Amino acid sequence: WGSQSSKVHIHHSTWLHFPGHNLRWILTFILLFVLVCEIAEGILSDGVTESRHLHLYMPAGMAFMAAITSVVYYHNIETSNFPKLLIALLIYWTLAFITKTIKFVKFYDHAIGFSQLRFCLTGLLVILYGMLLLVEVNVIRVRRYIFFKTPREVKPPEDLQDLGVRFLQPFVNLLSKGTYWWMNAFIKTAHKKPIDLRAIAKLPIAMRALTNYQRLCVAFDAQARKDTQSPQGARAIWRALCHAFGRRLILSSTFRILADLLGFAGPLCIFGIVDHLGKENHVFQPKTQFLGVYFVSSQEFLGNAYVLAVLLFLALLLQRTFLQASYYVAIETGINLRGAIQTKIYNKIMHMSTSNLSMGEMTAGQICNLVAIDTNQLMWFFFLCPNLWTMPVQIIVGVILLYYILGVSALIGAAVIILLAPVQYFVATKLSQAQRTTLEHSNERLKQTNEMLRGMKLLKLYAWESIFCSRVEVTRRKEMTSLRAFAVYTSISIFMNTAIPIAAVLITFVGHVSFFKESDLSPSVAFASLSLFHILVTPLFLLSSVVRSTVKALVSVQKLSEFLSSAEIREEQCNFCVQIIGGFFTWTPDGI
Amino acid sequence: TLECLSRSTLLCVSALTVISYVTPVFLVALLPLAVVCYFIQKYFRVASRDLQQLDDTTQLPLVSHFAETVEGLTTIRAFRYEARFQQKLLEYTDSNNIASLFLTAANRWLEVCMEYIGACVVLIAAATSISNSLHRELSAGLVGLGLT
Amino acid sequence: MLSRKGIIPEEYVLTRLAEDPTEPRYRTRERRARFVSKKGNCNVAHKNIREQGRFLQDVFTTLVDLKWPHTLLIFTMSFLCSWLLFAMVWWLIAFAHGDLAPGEGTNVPCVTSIHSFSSAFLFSIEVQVTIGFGGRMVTEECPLAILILIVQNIVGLMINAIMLGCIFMKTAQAHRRAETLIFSKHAVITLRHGRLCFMLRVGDLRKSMIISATIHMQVVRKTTSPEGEVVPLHQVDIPMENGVGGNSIFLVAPLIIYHVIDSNSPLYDLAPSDLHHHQDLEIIVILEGVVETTGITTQARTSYLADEILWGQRFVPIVAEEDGRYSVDYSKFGNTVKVPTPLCTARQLDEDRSLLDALTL
Amino acid sequence: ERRARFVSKKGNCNVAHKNIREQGRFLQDVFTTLVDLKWPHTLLIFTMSFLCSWLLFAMVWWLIAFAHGDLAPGEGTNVPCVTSIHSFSSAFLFSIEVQVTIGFGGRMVTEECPLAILILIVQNIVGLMINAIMLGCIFMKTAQAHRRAETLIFSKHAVITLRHGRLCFMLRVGDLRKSMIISATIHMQVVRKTTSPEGEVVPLHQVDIPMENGVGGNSIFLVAPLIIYHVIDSNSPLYDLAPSDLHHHQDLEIIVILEGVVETTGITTQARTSYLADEILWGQRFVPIVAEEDGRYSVDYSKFGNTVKVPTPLCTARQLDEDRSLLDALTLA
Numbered sequence A: 001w002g003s004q005s006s007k008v009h010i011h012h013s014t015w016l017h018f019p020g021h022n023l024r025w026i027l028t029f030i031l032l033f034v035l036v037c038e039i040a041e042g043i044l045s046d047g048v049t050e051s052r053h054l055h056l057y058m059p060a061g062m063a064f065m066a067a068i069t070s071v072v073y074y075h076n077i078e079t080s081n082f083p084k085l086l087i088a089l090l091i092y093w094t095l096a097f098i099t100k101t102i103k104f105v106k107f108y109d110h111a112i113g114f115s116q117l118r119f120c121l122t123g124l125l126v127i128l129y130g131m132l133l134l135v136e137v138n139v140i141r142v143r144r145y146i147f148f149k150t151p152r153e154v155k156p157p158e159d160l161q162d163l164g165v166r167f168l169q170p171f172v173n174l175l176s177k178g179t180y181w182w183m184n185a186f187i188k189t190a191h192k193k194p195i196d197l198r199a200i201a202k203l204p205i206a207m208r209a210l211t212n213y214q215r216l217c218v219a220f221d222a223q224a225r226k227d228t229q230s231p232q233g234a235r236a237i238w239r240a241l242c243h244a245f246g247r248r249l250i251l252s253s254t255f256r257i258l259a260d261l262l263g264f265a266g267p268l269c270i271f272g273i274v275d276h277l278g279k280e281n282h283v284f285q286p287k288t289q290f291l292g293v294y295f296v297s298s299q300e301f302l303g304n305a306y307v308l309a310v311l312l313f314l315a316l317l318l319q320r321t322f323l324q325a326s327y328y329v330a331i332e333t334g335i336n337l338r339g340a341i342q343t344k345i346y347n348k349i350m351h352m353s354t355s356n357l358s359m360g361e362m363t364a365g366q367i368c369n370l371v372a373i374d375t376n377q378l379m380w381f382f383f384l385c386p387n388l389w390t391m392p393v394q395i396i397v398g399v400i401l402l403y404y405i406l407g408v409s410a411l412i413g414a415a416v417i418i419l420l421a422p423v424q425y426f427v428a429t430k431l432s433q434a435q436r437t438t439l440e441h442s443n444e445r446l447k448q449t450n451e452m453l454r455g456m457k458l459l460k461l462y463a464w465e466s467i468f469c470s471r472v473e474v475t476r477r478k479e480m481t482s483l484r485a486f487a488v489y490t491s492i493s494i495f496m497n498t499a500i501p502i503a504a505v506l507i508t509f510v511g512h513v514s515f516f517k518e519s520d521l522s523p524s525v526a527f528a529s530l531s532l533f534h535i536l537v538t539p540l541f542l543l544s545s546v547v548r549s550t551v552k553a554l555v556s557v558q559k560l561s562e563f564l565s566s567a568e569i570r571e572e573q574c575n576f577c578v579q580i581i582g583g584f585f586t587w588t589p590d591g592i
Numbered sequence B: 001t002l003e004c005l006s007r008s009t010l011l012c013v014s015a016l017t018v019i020s021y022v023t024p025v026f027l028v029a030l031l032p033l034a035v036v037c038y039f040i041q042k043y044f045r046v047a048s049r050d051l052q053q054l055d056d057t058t059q060l061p062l063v064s065h066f067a068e069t070v071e072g073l074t075t076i077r078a079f080r081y082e083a084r085f086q087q088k089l090l091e092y093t094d095s096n097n098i099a100s101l102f103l104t105a106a107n108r109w110l111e112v113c114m115e116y117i118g119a120c121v122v123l124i125a126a127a128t129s130i131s132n133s134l135h136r137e138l139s140a141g142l143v144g145l146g147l148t
Numbered sequence C: 001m002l003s004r005k006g007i008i009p010e011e012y013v014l015t016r017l018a019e020d021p022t023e024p025r026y027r028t029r030e031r032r033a034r035f036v037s038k039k040g041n042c043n044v045a046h047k048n049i050r051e052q053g054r055f056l057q058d059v060f061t062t063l064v065d066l067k068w069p070h071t072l073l074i075f076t077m078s079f080l081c082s083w084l085l086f087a088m089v090w091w092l093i094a095f096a097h098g099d100l101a102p103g104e105g106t107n108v109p110c111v112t113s114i115h116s117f118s119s120a121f122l123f124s125i126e127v128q129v130t131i132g133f134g135g136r137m138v139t140e141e142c143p144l145a146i147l148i149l150i151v152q153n154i155v156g157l158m159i160n161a162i163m164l165g166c167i168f169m170k171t172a173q174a175h176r177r178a179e180t181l182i183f184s185k186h187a188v189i190t191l192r193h194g195r196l197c198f199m200l201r202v203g204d205l206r207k208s209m210i211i212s213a214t215i216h217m218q219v220v221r222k223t224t225s226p227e228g229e230v231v232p233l234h235q236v237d238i239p240m241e242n243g244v245g246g247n248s249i250f251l252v253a254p255l256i257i258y259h260v261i262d263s264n265s266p267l268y269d270l271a272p273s274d275l276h277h278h279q280d281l282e283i284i285v286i287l288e289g290v291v292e293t294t295g296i297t298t299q300a301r302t303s304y305l306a307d308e309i310l311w312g313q314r315f316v317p318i319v320a321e322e323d324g325r326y327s328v329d330y331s332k333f334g335n336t337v338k339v340p341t342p343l344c345t346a347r348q349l350d351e352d353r354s355l356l357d358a359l360t361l
Numbered sequence D: 001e002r003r004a005r006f007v008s009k010k011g012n013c014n015v016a017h018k019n020i021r022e023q024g025r026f027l028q029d030v031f032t033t034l035v036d037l038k039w040p041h042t043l044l045i046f047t048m049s050f051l052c053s054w055l056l057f058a059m060v061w062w063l064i065a066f067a068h069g070d071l072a073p074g075e076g077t078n079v080p081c082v083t084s085i086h087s088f089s090s091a092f093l094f095s096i097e098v099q100v101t102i103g104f105g106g107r108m109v110t111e112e113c114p115l116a117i118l119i120l121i122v123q124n125i126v127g128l129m130i131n132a133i134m135l136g137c138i139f140m141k142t143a144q145a146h147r148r149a150e151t152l153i154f155s156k157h158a159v160i161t162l163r164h165g166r167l168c169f170m171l172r173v174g175d176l177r178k179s180m181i182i183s184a185t186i187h188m189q190v191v192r193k194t195t196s197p198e199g200e201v202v203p204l205h206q207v208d209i210p211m212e213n214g215v216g217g218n219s220i221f222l223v224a225p226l227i228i229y230h231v232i233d234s235n236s237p238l239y240d241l242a243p244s245d246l247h248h249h250q251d252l253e254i255i256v257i258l259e260g261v262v263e264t265t266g267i268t269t270q271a272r273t274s275y276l277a278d279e280i281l282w283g284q285r286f287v288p289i290v291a292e293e294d295g296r297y298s299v300d301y302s303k304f305g306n307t308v309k310v311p312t313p314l315c316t317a318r319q320l321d322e323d324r325s326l327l328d329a330l331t332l333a
């Protein structure tokens, strides 16, 4: 750190993540989480005794500091390819595992039992310490640096060695892959040096258009090899994309599914925290003993208000980091899908014939919109693909546990959200229909004034400006009526977007008191439901757009597949300059 | 955009006011937290404008390149220059993608940072609200509003 | 969501003739990269350093390179950690022995007077720093504690000897002495003895002599060979024009260092016209020698860009005799005065002399 | 079989000294040998020196108390020679305290026995001497700069190509650290089993090689990687290196020795590499490495050793002088 203040080699240095870099961080974050649980239990138990009992949590409090440094120390040994310092790290995992296990087995001798939380967490720590120990040993197996005579050194990847690569997201520590920490330097640089193509450097190998195009062709080539299908239809393309980009699309879904589940921890923590505060009796406390240390149990651990707030804080960090990582994985795949499809479309442009039956039908405008409109709506579909797999899950899980929170009246009120959603699909559809009317009319007026602004000298020396301007105004009035309809539908869209959740709560709570009257609507139950409605409104009132994009994407692939199997320039695969003997030329593929 | 911009900043004002009222100890830490929020809201706009300008100005040559290839397809195949034009496309497409990838990262950089700040608010608000519900006797009513 | 892009269509409208970017285009006159700054501090940043840990393998070189406030932190941490690492050892040994229990001393304590970890920490200070108050003795009835007393002393002796060695190499640092070796802000080119030369003044401020001084001069410029090479920063050595050829100089008064521009010089075709700011030219001057006090060699690096050259100017006299001794008036260190000189290049000067010699004969 | 290397790619001269008529010169330089030892090995000598020293005087203190009758069980009438010596373990602990200067003081040196006063004097003199010896050795170990040479970097293989007409054996040397090597120096030597017209046979003849410096010297300024080339003139021993005999089993080797005092410590260091016959690529140049940034330069150490193909004659430098002379003579007429 003192040298880093005056270190210039780290200005553009390269790295090499050791074998097990991902399994190290995922264990460390799990280990950090459980060490917080031990702290919470330790401070929970000692509150009943007259003494501090510092041995309950300070050993765990020192572990949390040691665990954090163990990954800071490991990272500094990862950036500088000097694995020899991992011996100190290796000793720590060997030593911590042995000492903790002795504690764990001694709990069983005194018959602590799993019914005590400290026995569970200590047992868990043995597994986490053991697994982290195996990670360090696996480094020696692949790097071979301590004992083996010939170390199998590893060099930084070739794409990283380029000075012209500045999007270092694919190769950074797992914490920076989640928090996007590497962007900090680029963002700060944007304040002083404006961002041009100089700052945005060459993209990495994984995201290069040529690299993606190779994978798409391999997906097509393997499809035509494993399966012998003559046509290349919409299903042929759909199966092609999944092969070439499924292994990343599933990762985006996995993050979204977990972030969706972790999102409901908020309402459960809100329900848990307030319910404990809805009880007048705070003199009561966890009370069970084995030696006099007063081990706390599971249910008593999740009854303390402060415990749930801390667990909520940990859960929120995971949810809001998985959710953001879900977006990036979905987006990066979408950008690569666009990159590998623009190349495929352009590669089809070279290999297509120039027949008047072919090129006289699909003008340049037809193929230009294919790249702009047809590809983007397909590209945007891969952005929202995780939603349609998970938004049903998030809504169902939302509905399942919203039934338990308040009862039936919540489902009756939430039905209004579900029942009015199909109308919102109609509003959005009617919004677009009015949008195309303006879009087609704006182009007509803009094309009309383009002639006006092109011959202005003849339109100004002949005093025709007053006459020609009136044509623009009249065309504008026919344009502005369409825009007024669009403005109406987008105004109604906002109303249904924001007034339905208020209507859902209004129906839910009044209906609960009047029709049901099954409870007093305590803040534990009422305010837990308010969070659930906020969490459910966002997927409920945006799932219409996911469906609409999927409908549009089906057209785009259908349109793309029709274009991709058009006439081609034959005889490509198969003395005087102009040597023609027979020369029975033609334009129709067969005959004529 | 104006309707959603006002609703976004008013909901933040509405939320912050209620959290401050439920737990007056929160606004003691809000000022140190708001300053960090300002700098995140400061550097982002400088980069976001530049990236979005780079986002648009990089895709205009791409669509024109497609249009001109369709216009003069016969000439390009005649010169046997399709090898170079495909290489131009990869240079045109890669510039378009890398401009968009940085734009996405900037949005993701903002969204992660502006949600750890929100997470730090939740812990601070929950901690003070629970304590003020044990000593000042908030009676768990405003505590729920302080959380939702 | 509260975003304008909640539901958007596939949009593409022809923004016809999107021209006139009106870019600032200020990169042309942004800066001219320097090879070495005016005060050493080479302005070169390395990239793609494939380090294999050799950055930290030179621990004892690294510790000296660190600034003094950092050294104090490492000095403090290296000893605080050692005291506290063995504080846990003494506390735990007395815990396992059983003399930590606050009761009648029926047994013989492993290390006397250890009552709390505070006493365990203070006893760790006494052993390693060798204060040895003696309230907390080491008893003979603890065979394990005797081993740790041996270990703590050896580690305490080993840490001290290593830390003393690092400090001595930092006390002998002479990079601060090299900052009192002064070069003029701008060097001049003027005629001396009928031949053009690149003059320069370098002075020493402290009264302590710098022994075995040795001055080198190099030209940093991009060089293309007849074979078409591309050498970005080519360094060509420049003779000092000393009377004996060597680089050795005797620095008491501020000496004039000049390079006689003969036919073998890289500056043989420099004209005042091409001496503007953005000219691919730089002269690096490296003054070496061993400081007479610490015996440690030093370097003083300075560079002259093209806009830091002054064609056809003379260095003012600086040494003036006084009643009992000489006198160097450093106020006039870098003052320059114009001189009558040709505005032509060295090649033209040689060519004009060559034509005149033929006409005379 | 195999071809030996005079010096490996990282120094480490592969020469085996044999039949050494050892007069004990290995041990006479204990202080120099102690520094040459590895750090783990130094600790053993460091530890065993102190541990034996404490234990040598532990026996002395125990014997003194035994003879004086102090360790006789029971509270005797005599004044103890050294207080609280009731075991050799107590004598061992008192031995540690005196020499390390902890001085707890539960075991004092009384005024009764004069023999212990002498031994107390002896132990302090021995303690100060041994500590002074160990401090000096560790200071020179902490002042070691051989590991600095590990950051001095040479290209894997050198090249011979064209530059300003003549033929030069080019090369590249880089410095990875940020500290400077004051007063750098480059010596290049060609090692070949060279015979002489008189009939002598030199098994490994080392002929020095000029560095083609601007001032005909050895001083170089190492901040960014440089090209250390040697112009192959009429006197260069490489004047008759044809590309044909550049193969593996060619008795050829270029030693390069970079010397200079490290600015941090002031210790001179050497970096040595050898380019074998198979480690020289004819007719290749070194890629441009130093780029320019907004206000600084940029060295791409990824491209430190990359060489590209460059057109060149495939004839010996001796045939270059003859070809030029014939062309110049023909052009004159």
Ligand SMILES: CCCCCCCCCCCCCCCCCC(=O)OC[C@H](COP(=O)(O)OC[C@H](N)C(=O)O)OC(=O)CCCCCCCCCCCCCCCCC
Pocket (backbone or CB within 6 Å): A084, A085, A087, A088, A091, C056, C057, C059, C078, C079, C081, C082, C159, C162, D040
């Ligand atoms: C063949 C023999 C192998 C011996 C293996 C020993 C295993 C010990 C296990 C205990 C954990 C320690 C990890 C050490 C890993 C092995 C030693 C090691 O390689 O050190 C790494 C570095 C420099 O070494 P190197 O020049 O690359 O040596 C090559 C290699 N050791 C070999 O010869 O094959 O060394 C360093 O970087 C050392 C840092 C010293 C810092 C000095 C600061 C001054 C204060 C000192 C006191 C501080 C208090 C804490 C004490 C410990 C400090 C590290």
Ligand SMILES: CCCCCCCCCCCCCCCCCC(=O)OC[C@H](COP(=O)(O)OC[C@H](N)C(=O)O)OC(=O)CCCCCCCCCCCCCCCCC
Pocket (backbone or CB within 6 Å): A022, A026, A027, A029, A030, A032, A033, A170, A174, A175, A177, A178, A179, A251, A314, A317, A318, A321, A322, A325, A329
């Ligand atoms: C008891 C449990 C309670 C809760 C605590 C749980 C804490 C555990 C955290 C678990 C995180 C799991 C993430 C797993 C994903 C790891 C990254 C990953 O696999 O992708 C890495 C990739 C780059 O590789 P590639 O070149 O595509 O791989 C080659 C080829 N495709 C192949 O794999 O064959 O690159 C990518 O695809 C980028 C992926 C980015 C992923 C970013 C995730 C960061 C999460 C950070 C969490 C924030 C802090 C939370 C900790 C709280 C503790 C207090």
Ligand SMILES: CCCCCCCCCCCCCCCCCC(=O)OC[C@H](COP(=O)(O)OC[C@H](N)C(=O)O)OC(=O)CCCCCCCCCCCCCCCCC
Pocket (backbone or CB within 6 Å): A005, C066, C067, C068, C069, C070, C072, C076
């Ligand atoms: C991006 C930002 C990066 C910032 C990096 C810098 C961080 C600085 C931290 C600021 C607080 C430091 C307090 C230090 C107080 C003593 C030092 C002092 O007053 O300066 C006097 C100097 C240090 O000055 P320098 O210009 O930095 O020297 C660099 C040196 N010329 C070199 O470059 O080479 O030093 C000397 O000239 C050395 C004389 C030492 C003698 C004094 C004895 C003190 C011993 C320690 C006492 C404190 C013990 C505390 C123990 C606490 C235990 C709980």
Ligand SMILES: CCCCCCCCCCCCCCCCCC(=O)OC[C@H](COP(=O)(O)OC[C@H](N)C(=O)O)OC(=O)CCCCCCCCCCCCCCCCC
Pocket (backbone or CB within 6 Å): C057, C058, C059, C060, C150, C151, C154, C155, C158, C159, C162, D035, D036, D037, D038, D039, D040, D041, D043, D047, D141, D144, D146
């Ligand atoms: C009763 C118990 C008493 C215990 C006393 C211990 C005292 C510890 C003091 C704590 C601070 C010490 C810091 C010193 C570490 C500095 C190491 C460092 O920077 O260089 C690392 C070096 C590597 O170079 P080398 O090959 O040895 O160089 C030789 C050269 N001629 C020279 O002397 O510079 O050195 C190396 O090679 C690796 C250095 C690792 C340090 C060793 C620590 C102890 C290891 C013990 C096990 C060793 C087993 C193997 C023995 C050798 C087998 C070949």
Ligand SMILES: CCOc1cc(CC(=O)N[C@@H](CC(C)C)c2ccccc2N2CCCCC2)ccc1C(=O)O
Pocket (backbone or CB within 6 Å): A327, A330, A331, A383, A384, A387, A538, A539, A542, A543, A545, A546, B104, B107, B108, C001, C003, C005, C006, C007
């Ligand atoms: C530029 C578009 O790149 C992105 C892409 C995504 C993935 C995604 O599902 N998007 C659509 C969702 C569908 C229903 C339109 C969206 C757009 C605007 C605002 C919010 C949302 N939803 C996001 C998921 C949770 C509910 C609200 C996220 C974020 C971004 C981003 O701006 O960085």
Ligand SMILES: CCCCCCCCCCC(=O)O[C@H](COC(=O)CCCCC)COP(=O)(O)OCCN
Pocket (backbone or CB within 6 Å): A001, A004, A010, A032, A068, A071, A072, A075, A076, A079, A080, A173, A175
């Ligand atoms: C509850 C969840 C908490 C998660 C926290 C754990 C992750 C942190 C990772 C830090 C990291 O990885 O940062 C390190 C910071 O290092 C220092 O500043 C030196 C150490 C100073 C302090 C001892 C090293 O990276 P660097 O210095 O930027 O790397 C350049 C060198 N190659």
Ligand SMILES: CCCCCCCCCCC(=O)O[C@H](COC(=O)CCCCC)COP(=O)(O)OCCN
Pocket (backbone or CB within 6 Å): A036, A039, A040, A041, A043, A044, A046, A047, A048, A061, A064, A304, A306, A307, A310
């Ligand atoms: C370091 C890694 C993360 C730490 C997570 C802390 C979780 C604690 C959960 C329990 C809780 O928050 O407990 C309270 C703790 O408060 C403190 O004193 C602050 C402790 C600060 C710890 C650094 C005590 O109140 P109580 O449980 O009602 O006990 C009262 C009767 N004594």
Ligand SMILES: CCCCCCCCCCC(=O)O[C@H](COC(=O)CCCCC)COP(=O)(O)OCCN
Pocket (backbone or CB within 6 Å): A015, A079, A172, A173, A175, A176, A179, A181, A182, B116
């Ligand atoms: C709110 C949640 C709690 C945790 C807060 C801290 C999070 C740190 C993220 C770690 C990270 O992001 O780690 C590195 C960043 O280092 C630093 O500079 C850390 C500075 C830390 C400052 C406190 C990334 O370095 P890299 O991308 O591997 O760079 C390679 C070459 N260095």
Ligand SMILES: CCCCCCCCCCC(=O)O[C@H](COC(=O)CCCCC)COP(=O)(O)OCCN
Pocket (backbone or CB within 6 Å): A179, A184, A185, A187, A188, B036, B039, B040, B043, B112, B113, B116, B117
């Ligand atoms: C764990 C992640 C979540 C953190 C939540 C809050 C985010 C900011 C705090 C983290 C941080 O410290 O990030 C800062 C953000 O950076 C800037 O853009 C400059 C801002 C300067 C004025 C504020 C500084 O980082 P940096 O010094 O540019 O990082 C490189 C050297 N490591």
Ligand SMILES: CCCCCCCCCCC(=O)O[C@H](COC(=O)CCCCC)COP(=O)(O)OCCN
Pocket (backbone or CB within 6 Å): A033, A261, A262, A264, A265, A266, A268, A269, A271, A272, A302, A311, A312, A314, A315, A318, A397, A400, A401
């Ligand atoms: C499909 C059925 C519904 C599933 C709902 C989603 C479940 C989310 C996880 C469970 C949860 O959120 O667990 C709550 C505490 O939060 C955590 O433990 C978060 C993890 C923190 C990790 C960092 C426990 O609360 P509870 O026992 O339900 O309290 C009221 C009951 N009296």
Ligand SMILES: Nc1ncnc2c1ncn2[C@@H]1O[C@H](COP(=O)(O)OP(=O)(O)OP(=O)(O)O)[C@@H](O)[C@H]1O
Pocket (backbone or CB within 6 Å): C048, C049, C050, C051, D153, D154, D155, D156, D157, D176, D301, D302, D304, D305, D306
């Ligand atoms: N970026 C770099 N950082 C540090 N050392 C480097 C770097 N590039 C090359 N070297 C060093 O240069 C020498 C070899 O350079 P060169 O590039 O010609 O060969 P190489 O094939 O990369 O070497 P090797 O496989 O031995 O690392 C080695 O001593 C190597 O450590």
